[PDB]
Design an enzyme around this catalytic site. Structure first.
Site, PDB file in Angstrom:
ATOM      1  N   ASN A 192       0.761  -1.225   0.000  1.00 48.64           N
ATOM      2  CA  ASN A 192       0.000   0.000   0.000  1.00 48.64           C
ATOM      3  C   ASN A 192       0.793   1.276   0.000  1.00 48.64           C
ATOM      4  OD1 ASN A 192      -2.472  -1.273  -0.134  1.00 48.64           O
ATOM      5  ND2 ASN A 192      -2.445  -1.638   2.086  1.00 48.64           N
TER       6      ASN A 192
ATOM      7  N   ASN B 106      -5.241  -5.329   3.179  1.00 52.16           N
ATOM      8  CA  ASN B 106      -6.129  -4.571   4.063  1.00 52.16           C
ATOM      9  C   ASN B 106      -7.233  -3.772   3.387  1.00 52.16           C
ATOM     10  OD1 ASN B 106      -5.032  -5.436   6.586  1.00 52.16           O
ATOM     11  ND2 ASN B 106      -3.155  -4.399   5.995  1.00 52.16           N
TER      12      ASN B 106
ATOM     13  N   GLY C 232       2.293  -7.608   3.737  1.00 54.59           N
ATOM     14  CA  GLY C 232       2.900  -7.750   2.406  1.00 54.59           C
ATOM     15  C   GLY C 232       3.750  -8.992   2.260  1.00 54.59           C
TER      16      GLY C 232
ATOM     17  N   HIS D   8       0.707   5.519   2.796  1.00 57.49           N
ATOM     18  CA  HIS D   8      -0.234   4.779   1.957  1.00 57.49           C
ATOM     19  C   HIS D   8      -0.607   5.568   0.729  1.00 57.49           C
ATOM     20  CE1 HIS D   8      -1.899   2.413   5.636  1.00 57.49           C
ATOM     21  NE2 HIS D   8      -1.018   1.686   4.974  1.00 57.49           N
TER      22      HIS D   8
ATOM     23  N   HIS E  84       6.794  -3.506  13.362  1.00 49.91           N
ATOM     24  CA  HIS E  84       7.413  -3.923  12.126  1.00 49.91           C
ATOM     25  C   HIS E  84       8.804  -3.359  11.978  1.00 49.91           C
ATOM     26  CE1 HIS E  84       3.789  -5.837  10.779  1.00 49.91           C
ATOM     27  NE2 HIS E  84       3.099  -4.720  10.888  1.00 49.91           N
TER      28      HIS E  84
HETATM   29  C1  LIG Z   1      -4.199   1.821  23.208  1.00 47.82           C
HETATM   30  C2  LIG Z   1      -2.957   1.462  22.443  1.00 47.82           C
HETATM   31  O1  LIG Z   1      -2.335   2.291  21.782  1.00 47.82           O
HETATM   32  N1  LIG Z   1      -2.571   0.179  22.518  1.00 47.82           N
HETATM   33  C3  LIG Z   1      -1.667  -0.428  21.555  1.00 47.82           C
HETATM   34  C4  LIG Z   1      -2.332  -1.580  20.810  1.00 47.82           C
HETATM   35  O2  LIG Z   1      -3.655  -1.239  20.409  1.00 47.82           O
HETATM   36  C5  LIG Z   1      -1.496  -1.922  19.586  1.00 47.82           C
HETATM   37  O3  LIG Z   1      -2.082  -3.057  18.942  1.00 47.82           O
HETATM   38  C6  LIG Z   1      -2.694  -2.955  17.737  1.00 47.82           C
HETATM   39  O4  LIG Z   1      -3.914  -2.197  17.813  1.00 47.82           O
HETATM   40  C7  LIG Z   1      -4.698  -2.121  16.611  1.00 47.82           C
HETATM   41  C8  LIG Z   1      -5.985  -1.308  16.833  1.00 47.82           C
HETATM   42  O5  LIG Z   1      -5.697   0.089  16.691  1.00 47.82           O
HETATM   43  C9  LIG Z   1      -5.089  -3.525  16.173  1.00 47.82           C
HETATM   44  O6  LIG Z   1      -5.979  -4.037  17.160  1.00 47.82           O
HETATM   45  C10 LIG Z   1      -3.850  -4.399  15.993  1.00 47.82           C
HETATM   46  O7  LIG Z   1      -4.215  -5.751  15.688  1.00 47.82           O
HETATM   47  C11 LIG Z   1      -3.942  -5.974  14.306  1.00 47.82           C
HETATM   48  C12 LIG Z   1      -4.951  -5.230  13.424  1.00 47.82           C
HETATM   49  O8  LIG Z   1      -6.145  -5.617  13.408  1.00 47.82           O
HETATM   50  O9  LIG Z   1      -4.593  -4.194  12.767  1.00 47.82           O
HETATM   51  C13 LIG Z   1      -4.179  -7.476  14.288  1.00 47.82           C
HETATM   52  C14 LIG Z   1      -3.891  -8.083  12.930  1.00 47.82           C
HETATM   53  O10 LIG Z   1      -4.109  -9.515  13.063  1.00 47.82           O
HETATM   54  C15 LIG Z   1      -2.440  -7.736  12.518  1.00 47.82           C
HETATM   55  N2  LIG Z   1      -2.159  -8.152  11.164  1.00 47.82           N
HETATM   56  C16 LIG Z   1      -1.074  -8.863  10.745  1.00 47.82           C
HETATM   57  C17 LIG Z   1      -0.120  -9.217  11.804  1.00 47.82           C
HETATM   58  O11 LIG Z   1      -0.804  -9.234   9.548  1.00 47.82           O
HETATM   59  C18 LIG Z   1      -2.225  -6.235  12.636  1.00 47.82           C
HETATM   60  C19 LIG Z   1      -0.837  -5.660  12.289  1.00 47.82           C
HETATM   61  O12 LIG Z   1       0.176  -6.416  12.960  1.00 47.82           O
HETATM   62  C20 LIG Z   1      -0.820  -4.169  12.697  1.00 47.82           C
HETATM   63  O13 LIG Z   1      -1.856  -3.473  11.986  1.00 47.82           O
HETATM   64  C21 LIG Z   1       0.487  -3.418  12.472  1.00 47.82           C
HETATM   65  O14 LIG Z   1       0.580  -3.022  11.094  1.00 47.82           O
HETATM   66  O15 LIG Z   1      -2.576  -5.821  13.974  1.00 47.82           O
HETATM   67  C22 LIG Z   1      -3.002  -4.380  17.264  1.00 47.82           C
HETATM   68  O16 LIG Z   1      -1.784  -5.079  17.015  1.00 47.82           O
HETATM   69  C23 LIG Z   1      -0.029  -2.179  19.951  1.00 47.82           C
HETATM   70  C24 LIG Z   1       0.900  -1.772  18.834  1.00 47.82           C
HETATM   71  O17 LIG Z   1       1.400  -2.970  18.190  1.00 47.82           O
HETATM   72  S1  LIG Z   1       1.333  -3.271  16.620  1.00 47.82           S
HETATM   73  O18 LIG Z   1       2.189  -2.175  15.972  1.00 47.82           O
HETATM   74  O19 LIG Z   1      -0.078  -3.043  16.208  1.00 47.82           O
HETATM   75  O20 LIG Z   1       2.081  -4.526  16.437  1.00 47.82           O
HETATM   76  O21 LIG Z   1       0.415  -1.359  21.052  1.00 47.82           O
HETATM   77  C25 LIG Z   1      -0.471  -1.163  22.149  1.00 47.82           C
HETATM   78  O22 LIG Z   1       0.111  -0.346  23.104  1.00 47.82           O
HETATM   79  C1  LIG Z   2      -1.949   2.912  10.529  1.00 50.03           C
HETATM   80  C2  LIG Z   2      -1.051   1.708  10.532  1.00 50.03           C
HETATM   81  O1  LIG Z   2      -0.456   1.345  11.545  1.00 50.03           O
HETATM   82  N1  LIG Z   2      -0.938   1.049   9.356  1.00 50.03           N
HETATM   83  C3  LIG Z   2      -0.611  -0.369   9.243  1.00 50.03           C
HETATM   84  C4  LIG Z   2       0.801  -0.539   8.675  1.00 50.03           C
HETATM   85  O2  LIG Z   2       1.725  -0.303   9.743  1.00 50.03           O
HETATM   86  C5  LIG Z   2       1.170  -1.834   7.960  1.00 50.03           C
HETATM   87  F1  LIG Z   2       2.212  -2.443   8.668  1.00 50.03           F
HETATM   88  C6  LIG Z   2      -0.031  -2.900   7.634  1.00 50.03           C
HETATM   89  O3  LIG Z   2      -0.285  -2.885   6.237  1.00 50.03           O
HETATM   90  P1  LIG Z   2      -0.570  -1.781   5.133  1.00 50.03           P
HETATM   91  O4  LIG Z   2      -0.180  -0.417   5.501  1.00 50.03           O
HETATM   92  O5  LIG Z   2      -1.997  -1.833   4.752  1.00 50.03           O
HETATM   93  O6  LIG Z   2       0.229  -2.050   3.791  1.00 50.03           O
HETATM   94  C7  LIG Z   2       0.232  -3.334   3.121  1.00 50.03           C
HETATM   95  C8  LIG Z   2       1.654  -3.792   2.988  1.00 50.03           C
HETATM   96  O7  LIG Z   2       2.332  -2.945   2.032  1.00 50.03           O
HETATM   97  C9  LIG Z   2       3.689  -2.795   2.423  1.00 50.03           C
HETATM   98  N2  LIG Z   2       3.969  -1.371   2.538  1.00 50.03           N
HETATM   99  C10 LIG Z   2       2.995  -0.486   2.940  1.00 50.03           C
HETATM  100  C11 LIG Z   2       3.210   0.835   2.937  1.00 50.03           C
HETATM  101  C12 LIG Z   2       4.485   1.283   2.500  1.00 50.03           C
HETATM  102  N3  LIG Z   2       4.739   2.566   2.414  1.00 50.03           N
HETATM  103  N4  LIG Z   2       5.444   0.428   2.132  1.00 50.03           N
HETATM  104  C13 LIG Z   2       5.220  -0.907   2.146  1.00 50.03           C
HETATM  105  O8  LIG Z   2       6.083  -1.713   1.836  1.00 50.03           O
HETATM  106  C14 LIG Z   2       3.895  -3.585   3.726  1.00 50.03           C
HETATM  107  O9  LIG Z   2       4.286  -4.921   3.445  1.00 50.03           O
HETATM  108  C15 LIG Z   2       2.476  -3.650   4.267  1.00 50.03           C
HETATM  109  O10 LIG Z   2       2.312  -4.751   5.141  1.00 50.03           O
HETATM  110  C16 LIG Z   2       0.176  -4.387   8.046  1.00 50.03           C
HETATM  111  O11 LIG Z   2      -0.621  -5.163   8.503  1.00 50.03           O
HETATM  112  O12 LIG Z   2       1.325  -4.820   7.764  1.00 50.03           O
HETATM  113  O13 LIG Z   2      -1.224  -2.505   8.264  1.00 50.03           O
HETATM  114  C17 LIG Z   2      -1.644  -1.131   8.399  1.00 50.03           C
HETATM  115  C18 LIG Z   2      -3.130  -1.136   8.800  1.00 50.03           C
HETATM  116  O14 LIG Z   2      -3.399  -2.097   9.829  1.00 50.03           O
HETATM  117  C19 LIG Z   2      -4.117  -1.396   7.657  1.00 50.03           C
HETATM  118  O15 LIG Z   2      -3.806  -0.667   6.464  1.00 50.03           O
HETATM  119  C20 LIG Z   2      -5.581  -1.099   8.060  1.00 50.03           C
HETATM  120  O16 LIG Z   2      -6.300  -0.409   7.032  1.00 50.03           O
END
Ligand SMILES: CC(=O)N[C@@H]1[C@@H](O)[C@H](O[C@@H]2O[C@H](CO)[C@H](O)[C@H](O[C@]3(C(=O)O)C[C@H](O)[C@@H](NC(C)=O)[C@H]([C@H](O)[C@H](O)CO)O3)[C@H]2O)[C@@H](COS(=O)(=O)O)O[C@H]1O
Ligand SMILES: CC(=O)N[C@@H]1[C@@H](O)[C@@H](F)[C@@](OP(=O)(O)OC[C@H]2O[C@@H](n3ccc(N)nc3=O)[C@H](O)[C@@H]2O)(C(=O)O)O[C@H]1[C@H](O)[C@H](O)CO
Ligand SMILES: CC(=O)N[C@@H]1[C@@H](O)[C@H](O[C@@H]2O[C@H](CO)[C@H](O)[C@H](O[C@]3(C(=O)O)C[C@H](O)[C@@H](NC(C)=O)[C@H]([C@H](O)[C@H](O)CO)O3)[C@H]2O)[C@@H](COS(=O)(=O)O)O[C@H]1O
Ligand SMILES: CC(=O)N[C@@H]1[C@@H](O)[C@@H](F)[C@@](OP(=O)(O)OC[C@H]2O[C@@H](n3ccc(N)nc3=O)[C@H](O)[C@@H]2O)(C(=O)O)O[C@H]1[C@H](O)[C@H](O)CO
Ligand SMILES: *[C@@H]1O[C@H](CO[C@@H]2O[C@@H](C)[C@@H](O)[C@@H](O)[C@@H]2O)[C@@H](O[C@@H]2O[C@H](CO)[C@@H](O)[C@H](O)[C@H]2NC(C)=O)[C@H](O)[C@H]1NC(C)=O
Ligand SMILES: *[C@@H]1O[C@H](CO)[C@@H](O[C@@H]2O[C@H](CO)[C@@H](O)[C@H](O)[C@H]2NC(C)=O)[C@H](O)[C@H]1NC(C)=O
Ligand SMILES: *[C@@H]1O[C@H](CO)[C@@H](O[C@@H]2O[C@H](CO)[C@@H](O)[C@H](O)[C@H]2NC(C)=O)[C@H](O)[C@H]1NC(C)=O
Ligand SMILES: *[C@@H]1O[C@H](CO)[C@@H](O[C@@H]2O[C@H](CO)[C@@H](O)[C@H](O)[C@H]2NC(C)=O)[C@H](O)[C@H]1NC(C)=O
Ligand SMILES: *[C@@H]1O[C@H](CO)[C@@H](O[C@@H]2O[C@H](CO)[C@@H](O)[C@H](O)[C@H]2NC(C)=O)[C@H](O)[C@H]1NC(C)=O
Ligand SMILES: *[C@@H]1O[C@H](CO)[C@@H](O)[C@H](O)[C@H]1NC(C)=O
Ligand SMILES: *[C@@H]1O[C@H](CO)[C@@H](O)[C@H](O)[C@H]1NC(C)=O
Ligand SMILES: *[C@@H]1O[C@H](CO)[C@@H](O)[C@H](O)[C@H]1NC(C)=O
EC number: 2.4.3.-
Lengths: 286, 277
Positions: free
Chosen positions: A78, A101, A213, A248, A260
């Site tokens: 993205n 996503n 990704g 994005h 990450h």
């Molecule tokens: C209140 C606060 O700041 N607490 C944060 C945690 O919330 C945070 O965890 C992440 O929070 C977001 C909600 O805003 C999501 O619940 C996330 O879970 C996912 C997601 O749904 O986006 C779960 C997915 O299964 C993951 N997808 C994968 C692994 O392919 C996805 C992904 O790893 C993330 O989007 C990162 O790109 O996460 C919670 O993980 C946490 C920060 O950790 S992390 O950067 O999200 O790894 O920190 C707490 O303090």
């Molecule tokens: C707000 C937030 O925390 N953004 C995260 C972001 O840190 C990223 F980690 C990831 O994916 P996401 O941005 O959608 O992007 C899809 C994939 O594209 C590649 N990429 C993306 C942007 C960039 N500039 N260079 C890249 O190389 C990475 O491999 C990434 O996993 C994730 O799960 O890995 O998830 C999002 C959101 O959870 C999601 O978009 C919800 O709508």
């Protein structure tokens, strides 16, 4: 850039030694019991989620990628680097397009294409963009987005982190409620990250969490003959002009750039690019 | 304090003119369709909750209070005035005890009693005290608390405010998962507050939201011959000792309190504000 098919098939084999990709792709009805407690990959063991009758009824009977083969796959991340790339046409020419996503395409067809055969769905997407389906309008809005996906695969990782629990319940109820009205093929991977990590640990890549990704690259490797990467560029400047880039491609032009190590992922993919394993596009396609 | 039975029986009749209490008490299986959209009493119409097969299966077949008639009922609110009151025994002597929001009794028996025949469950309790059943320990805690309720009624108002949507799904899944293992009778009121508000409007009480306590009074009036109120005192000083008091005994309400004190004075109900011993 010249594809090195031999090197790539060797990579596939090496991935398959650690990852049963066809199986890992999704839980299936007969791989879970009703009531079964799931743990989360990146959470403490104390966190659990019970699989209802309803959740189970949404699982596929057989892996959606079993006996599937595509020649040229695009995996589209993205990154803001896609903006103004005009890669749409080249992406859509692929036999199979993976997106991440639930990223939008309609508004950006020229650059990112309109072909989608799989899109992932971090559960947080439902909270962030669809308000947990609390209102009629959010429900309608989600329904339309899903209908526009036609028969593509919606790949929902619900068991990586415990914050997905509530959204998962909402999703399950919505999909049961609208059963029969949508052609989307749901896929629900289980606890697969201990296996996926194993492969990338040998390439000297192990962050807190692999990105979506690279998780898509990993699965594509099993069913694609040649992978072409787009939208992988986790930096805030355009590699050529050096102008600010949003994180994005669908962030508001302007927007300024945890778990990450996306740079390490990128350097590893660029390396693979140079070895002919895969084609990483970092420029305008036209 | 002397009960005025005649005044109370007139109050019951008046409540029943606005509130079909036995029906309003709970949705039943046959009063909803799968896929029906529920609205919330205190929320904008746009907020909805689609009835799942699972939610419906957790509804009672008939109102759990149908043909229940008790003589003396205690309605126990959660005021810090109960602390050191030693009202436990007098509460437990009642034929039927209503409690509010799953309040704890074990640790406080001497003051609040251990008898419970109904307790309410604001859905926010699950978030606040049970962490949304996210962990094994929270699930175990919730399971044991529910087992200790034996065959009491758990009255869950899930359709008053839209923030209850998600926790409703958590609760539904937990109760489906443990189906067969718990004797608790679930009750789930629908959109009843426009009816309940009608009775209280005539008594010159209409806040944004009536409290659970006064909602329990309303329902108790249909099935109790005499209601005795405990733990109703929304103020931060003890009327007797004058010490600071916590809001809850395990730490517009004034208009509600003045109205209940009024009813006390008319012999409709007995409001206890003192130590029972
Ligand atoms: C209140 C606060 O700041 N607490 C944060 C945690 O919330 C945070 O965890 C992440 O929070 C977001 C909600 O805003 C999501 O619940 C996330 O879970 C996912 C997601 O749904 O986006 C779960 C997915 O299964 C993951 N997808 C994968 C692994 O392919 C996805 C992904 O790893 C993330 O989007 C990162 O790109 O996460 C919670 O993980 C946490 C920060 O950790 S992390 O950067 O999200 O790894 O920190 C707490 O303090
Ligand atoms: C707000 C937030 O925390 N953004 C995260 C972001 O840190 C990223 F980690 C990831 O994916 P996401 O941005 O959608 O992007 C899809 C994939 O594209 C590649 N990429 C993306 C942007 C960039 N500039 N260079 C890249 O190389 C990475 O491999 C990434 O996993 C994730 O799960 O890995 O998830 C999002 C959101 O959870 C999601 O978009 C919800 O709508
Ligand atoms: C962002 C923000 O600060 N907004 C606030 C809201 O917090 C507040 O909403 C109330 O939100 C709480 C959060 O804990 C609850 O979700 C509450 O819903 C209940 C509850 O579960 O406790 C819903 C129950 O059905 C109600 N039970 C009844 C009516 O018998 C119960 C009841 O009204 C209690 O007094 C409150 O627990 O509420 C949300 O209503 C929002 C409204 O405030 S208030 O709760 O009336 O004080 O106010 C925003 O400012
Ligand atoms: C912060 C928060 O959300 N607190 C609310 C609170 O605004 C109150 F509205 C109420 O009930 P709650 O306090 O438990 O108490 C039960 C009843 O006791 C009476 N009372 C209470 C304290 C006091 N000092 N004097 C009294 O008269 C009132 O009739 C109240 O209806 C409710 O829906 O009425 O619900 C709670 C929570 O949902 C619950 O406690 C979570 O565990
Ligand atoms: C599977 O795809 C390969 C590769 O196709 C080439 O590169 C793709 C990215 C895309 O640009 C295609 O249009 C290119 O042709 C195909 O192998 C080529 O096959 C054509 C057809 O005979 C031939 O002209 C080329 O010399 C081959 N090139 C290479 C590098 O091998 C292959 O045909 C496709 N097979 C199927 C069944 O679809
Ligand atoms: C395709 O990539 C592979 C992967 O590194 C290359 O295969 C090996 O290359 C080195 C070069 O000395 C040798 O040690 C091995 O004997 C090679 N493997 C095989 C199976 O022959 C290969 O050189 C690359 N092909 C092209 C065109 O670059
Ligand atoms: C990949 O997905 C696309 C949809 O994005 C599929 O292509 C569509 O197929 C339908 C049915 O034949 C056509 O009417 C559309 O014109 C095609 N759309 C586009 C945008 O090309 C494609 O067949 C899928 N490929 C698979 C599953 O291999
Ligand atoms: C709550 O009780 C009231 C009755 O006091 C119910 O309202 C009546 O419903 C019937 C049939 O739908 C109407 O014909 C009456 O006119 C209603 N009475 C009044 C005063 O409006 C109400 O349906 C009950 N609701 C629930 C959810 O149990
Ligand atoms: C109200 O609830 C209480 C439980 O809190 C019931 O009393 C218990 O009943 C069992 C079975 O008869 C006894 O063995 C226990 O000793 C009783 N416990 C207490 C604390 O008194 C009581 O029957 C219920 N009352 C009504 C009218 O349903
Ligand atoms: C993923 O694959 C491994 C083999 O790589 C296997 O033993 C495990 O069950 C799989 N997990 C899934 C499909 O969740
Ligand atoms: C009891 O209440 C009724 C209703 O107001 C009244 O008519 C009656 O006189 C009262 N009797 C008393 C206080 O003894
Ligand atoms: C109600 O309780 C009181 C107090 O002991 C009693 O005197 C009265 O007769 C009871 N029973 C009935 C059926 O009214």
């Amino acid at each position: 850039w010249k594809f090195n098919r031999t090197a790539f098939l060797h990579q596939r084999q090496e991935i398959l030694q650690h990852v049963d990709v066809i199986k890992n792709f999704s839980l299936t009805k007969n791989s879970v019991r009703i009531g079964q407690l799931m743990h989360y990959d990146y959470s403490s063991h104390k966190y659990v989620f019970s699989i209802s009758n309803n959740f189970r009824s949404l699982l596929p009977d057989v892996s959606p990628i079993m006996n599937k083969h595509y020649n040229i796959c695009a995996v589209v991340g993205n990154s803001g680097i896609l903006t103004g790339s005009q890669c749409g046409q080249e992406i859509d020419k692929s036999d199979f397009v993976f997106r991440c996503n639930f990223a939008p395409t309609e508004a950006f067809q020229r650059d990112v294409g309109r072909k989608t055969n799989l899109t992932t769905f971090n559960p947080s997407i439902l909270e962030k963009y669809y308000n947990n389906l609390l209102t009629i309008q959010d429900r309608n809005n989600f329904f339309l987005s899903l209908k526009k996906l036609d028969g593509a695969i919606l790949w929902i990782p619900a068991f990586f982190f415990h914050t997905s629990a509530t959204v998962t319940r909402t999703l399950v109820d919505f999909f049961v409620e609208h059963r029969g009205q949508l052609k989307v093929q749901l896929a629900w991977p289980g606890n697969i990250m201990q296996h996926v990590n194993r492969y990338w640990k040998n390439k000297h890549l192990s962050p807190k969490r692999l990105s979506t990704g690279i998780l898509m690259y990993t699965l594509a490797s099993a069913i694609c003959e040649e992978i072409h990467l787009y939208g992988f560029w986790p930096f805030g400047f355009d590699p050529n002009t050096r102008e600010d880039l949003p994180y994005h491609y669908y962030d508001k032009k302007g927007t300024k750039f945890e778990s990450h190590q996306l740079p390490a992922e990128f350097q590893l993919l660029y390396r693979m690019h140079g070895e002919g394993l895969t084609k990483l596009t970092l420029s305008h396609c036209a």
